[PDB]
Design a protein around this ligand. Structure first.
Ligand SMILES: [Fe+3]
Ligand SMILES: [Fe+3]
Lengths: 342, 352
């Protein structure tokens, strides 16, 4: 029970990856997803209390902890193709706000725009910083974890054709990582084993599953509403299979409709004027090469009226069953009063 | 420009309440609402860092607002009574007695219950975190766990066994702060014991109430909406009599923005309703109270000046359809956003 799954982007718990990349990344202390995004060596921006523990596995499900771990080229492209109306093959390139500074990258995109390549610049907390929609007297401010921007020009001045937003869902873990991260620290410095791996696992409590959908729903329901409209191309939510299972509860376990393509959809999409997406990805796919690529397991097109109806109409309908938790709640009360009886 | 508004249930910023109860409660170090709820004297359960600071005042552009921070402050007999009448469908005059869960250990209290019940007095028992502990509805195949800040239980019997007819749910919204209040608490702490004489208002009070950060306005409605929508859907059904949310005027003003500034219907009585609730199946309520009404009562009574019967379908529509429509305005924040992206890119543009 309870173990660190990845250490600096490389597996450790079920399979212990020790490749030419995994050797150096661990020692130098580098989260590769940021380094690949930029063009320069950068560390996992977490505190030394919970350093390279970018992914964690408990009783057997993996969980996403470092939001920077979501920066997977294979996932980015996959998600962006559905947010902006792209086909499977259309040429696609991603930048990152800070890397607009060097001439080499700019020459590349100029050459790319000329031949019709979809150039997308992304903005993220530790990269180019993240961006927010303005407050209004009738609507609130919202921040995006990822802001994807269809670049169309960078020489007269920066100009963007359209924009998408992606939201990355991370998990909390009650206690601290300091014993687990502390134990594997001395092991890594100078000098797989059942005795050694047991120490790196035994230290931390389980997931903080209390808020997995409670904190997310509103901004999701809200940001999904803005998706198909007003130079906003689409809104997506990125979640691991672990979190999707939890989500199915709050959504009264529906049945996804499997479209012609490798696509599923909540409710009827046939004529949907929004562009809302939920991407369920696998943390450990069939392959085991380099850092594990975040493959899209499920690509779900959301119907906002079904998401609201399921979450807030159909779900509490199941809670109001004639044998359900609201009918039997009075019993919990009565039993608790008994505790006080002399 | 941020001050401690209430110290141990007594005002400390706008006007200095120096009544007899104000002098005792603070010096003894007691949160008086827990003391009243129990039948034992009890201190504010908050840590030595953010001690008896139960309410906080901030500037917020202009006008200046009061925020609730100690959830134990909402334990106001007058409020709880006013609120519960609406949840259960009690008339304004019917006798009503409230009894905290831990006080069921006493027999003299239990003998009181038996007496009231035989007279036809409505006996409600409540379950709050520090008091009787919180209560939760259990998660199923198709629904999640929820715990209620206040579980209001309509007692039906007590002698043979505990029996309840139906239950109410009251939820209290508290405001979070950025930094610790320890610098402010510490300064007022030294002043309280090491120096007699209330009088400290200009140099003394302002400094003691300084070193304080503003409110975390980020989670004001977003963190509460689902919780609310879901619990509201349950309100008029299956032995759940009703469910209410208690929020200060300050938070309410903010809640209107998230709801696209809707106009409230005016019922015959002193209630308001959000949307048409004439044939409403649920029993959903929002209770807005003033923290500082024009009164000089030692601890300020939380008098709900607004009691709003909610239409669940209306609540959702406004929060999840109308508000995003505002955001998608002709020149709104969604249209304008593309400019923020472009302006940002310039901050990474090559120079020299
Ligand atoms: Fe990382
Ligand atoms: Fe208090």
């Amino acid at each position: 029970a309870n173990f660190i799954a990845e250490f600096f982007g490389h597996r450790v718990y079920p399979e212990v990856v020790s490749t030419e990349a995994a050797r150096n990344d661990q020692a130098t202390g580098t989260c590769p997803f940021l380094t690949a995004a930029k063009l320069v060596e950068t560390s996992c921006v977490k505190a030394e209390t919970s350093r390279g523990v970018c992914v964690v596995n408990t009783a057997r499900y993996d969980w996403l902890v470092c939001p920077n771990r979501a920066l997977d080229p294979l996932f980015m492209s996959a998600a962006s193709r559905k947010l902006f109306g792209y086909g499977p093959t259309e040429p696609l390139q991603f930048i990152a706000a800070p890397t607009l500074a060097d001439q080499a990258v700019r020459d590349g995109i100029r050459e790319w725009l000329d031949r019709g390549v979809h150039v997308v610049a992304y903005f993220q907390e530790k990269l180019g910083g993240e961006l927010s929609i303005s407050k209004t007297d009738s609507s609130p401010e919202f921040s995006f974890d990822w802001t994807l921007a269809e670049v169309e020009s960078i020489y007269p001045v920066p100009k963007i054709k359209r924009y998408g937003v992606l939201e990355i869902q991370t998990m909390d873990f009650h206690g601290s990582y300091k014993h687990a991260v502390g134990a594997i620290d001395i092991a890594l410095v100078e000098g797989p084993t059942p005795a050694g791996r047991a120490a790196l696992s035994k230290k931390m409590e389980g997931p903080n599953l209390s808020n997995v959908f409670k904190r997310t729903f509103y901004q999701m329901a809200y940001k999904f509403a803005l998706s198909g409209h007003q130079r906003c191309a689409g809104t997506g939510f990125a979640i691991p299979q672990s979190v999707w299972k939890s989500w199915l509860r709050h959504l009264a376990n529906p049945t996804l409709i499997d479209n012609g393509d490798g696509t599923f959809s909540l409710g009827d999409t046939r004529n949907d004027s929004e562009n809302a997406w939920i991407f369920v990805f696998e943390l450990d796919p069939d392959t085991d090469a380099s850092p594990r690529p975040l493959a899209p397991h499920l690509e779900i097109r959301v119907n906002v009226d079904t998401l609201i109806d399921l979450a807030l109409r159909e779900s509490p309908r199941a809670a109001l069953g004639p044998s359900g938790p609201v009918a039997t709640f009075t019993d919990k009360v009565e039993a608790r009063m008994l505790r006080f009886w002399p």
